[PDB]
């Protein structure tokens, strides 16, 4: 997995590749690693996929209830604190490595969080197996006062480094943009640089090819009237 987060002028952007692997095998070619915690707080997850999904939804649920209770729009530091205290308690066994970002009444924020519950702050971050490929690009092209367009470009360039150079990452680039005073725009499959080429042959079979012993209509209906 490759995930990044980049701050810009008036907000924050996160991106991620779309490959999930079982050892050397690609289980899903178009995985969604960008998670919504609240409308304007999204986080990218690397590590154990079930853990990143589960911990993201639990905290998301509790954040929603908190927002309703306080009559306030949720803040990123709350999602951060809730995530880290949960993860720390499980001493790393919940394998969720997250880049947490969003906008709230306080401003725009970017954090990352390791599975053991240690957190950090920055203008640009990366996590996952492709984090070194990504970080090399971030350390090469990042500057102060990025515009929205510059940050999207930098973020997806860093995901591409991971896609091309890391065997743990591949397929497509997802992006989410969180700008102050605007709706978050989740850009699913922002890039598509890995369409499979056309096959040499069609493997559609002549009907009747397969040997059959028995057929039966399976009854999916409930018990019938009359």
């Amino acid at each position: 997995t490759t995930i990044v987060g980049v701050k810009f002028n008036n907000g924050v952007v996160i991106a991620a590749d779309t490959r999930s692997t079982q050892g050397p095998i690609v289980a899903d070619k178009n995985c969604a690693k960008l998670h919504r915690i609240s409308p304007k707080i999204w986080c990218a997850g690397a590590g154990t996929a079930a853990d990143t999904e589960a911990v993201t939804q639990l905290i998301g649920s509790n954040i929603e209830l908190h927002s309703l209770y306080t009559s306030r729009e949720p803040r990123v530091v709350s999602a951060l604190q809730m995530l880290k205290q949960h993860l720390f308690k499980y001493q790393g066994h919940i394998g969720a490595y997250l880049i947490v970002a969003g906008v709230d009444p306080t401003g725009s924020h970017l954090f990352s969080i390791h599975a053991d519950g240690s957190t950090d702050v920055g203008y640009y971050l990366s996590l996952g197996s492709g984090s070194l490929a990504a970080m090399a690009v971030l350390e090469s092209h990042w500057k102060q006062d990025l515009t929205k367009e510059e940050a999207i470009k930098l973020a997806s360039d860093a995901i591409q480094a991971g896609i091309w150079n890391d065997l743990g990452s591949g397929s497509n680039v997802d992006v989410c943009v969180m700008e102050i005073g605007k709706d978050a725009e989740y850009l699913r499959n922002y890039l598509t640089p890995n369409v499979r080429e056309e096959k040499q042959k069609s493997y559609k079979f002549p009907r009747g090819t397969t040997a059959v012993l028995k057929e039966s209509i399976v009854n999916i209906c409930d018990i019938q009237e009359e």
């Binding site: 205290q85 720390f88 001493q91 390791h114 519950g117 702050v121």
Partner: protein, 196 residues
């Protein structure tokens, strides 16, 4: 980590490098290891980032609640709360913390809490992997009741050497000044301290 805290004539200064490490990979080169648990009681963190952050967050909570009930806590009190956490959970923590604060009666104070959770009140303290390389230097160059500038220089020079030899340490040198005059943050970049 290279961290230290030094008492001087007008109070105390905390200092740290900014490197966080996962093996040979620098996970963060601009880390803030100088953390605030009260307006004028801060700490330097070394060991597991997860452990030291969790501890500092809890201590800050205790001292906020202390303040609401009994007014401003002493630096000694802050150190005791840290110690309780570090001592009672010694089997599950990797945390070496220096606690530094400024009272008006007691002036500048420094308490170091090593791995086992013991407490040691000192005129100055050094800790983290980088500290080993500056025991000689710091012992030879520390005097009591230095001025603000002499103390800033002592810490800058000391952590410069610790960074020079310890690959785990590096980045910028952060400092936090604690006096009656308030709270001052300082930063020193590679090109300044490396050539010293």
């Amino acid at each position: 980590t290279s961290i230290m805290a030094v008492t001087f004539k007008d109070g105390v200064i905390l200092g740290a490098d900014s490197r966080t490490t996962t093996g040979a990979y620098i996970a963060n080169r601009v880390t803030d290891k100088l953390t605030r648990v009260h307006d004028k009681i801060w700490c330097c963190r070394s060991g597991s980032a997860a452990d030291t952050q969790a501890i500092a967050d809890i201590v800050q909570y205790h001292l906020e609640l202390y303040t609401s009930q009994y007014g401003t806590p002493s630096t000694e009190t802050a150190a005791s709360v840290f110690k309780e956490l570090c001592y009672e959970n010694k089997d599950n923590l990797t945390a070496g913390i220096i606690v530094a604060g400024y009272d008006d009666k007691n002036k500048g104070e420094v308490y170091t809490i090593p791995l086992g959770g013991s407490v040691h009140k000192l005129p100055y303290a050094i800790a983290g992997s980088g500290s080993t390389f500056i025991y000689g230097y710091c012992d030879k160059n520390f005097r009591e009741n230095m001025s603000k500038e002499e103390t800033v220089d002592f810490i800058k020079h000391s952590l410069s050497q610790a960074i020079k030899w310890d690959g785990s340490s590096g980045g910028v040198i952060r400092m936090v000044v604690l006096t009656a005059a308030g709270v001052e943050r300082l930063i020193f970049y590679p090109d300044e301290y490396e050539q010293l």
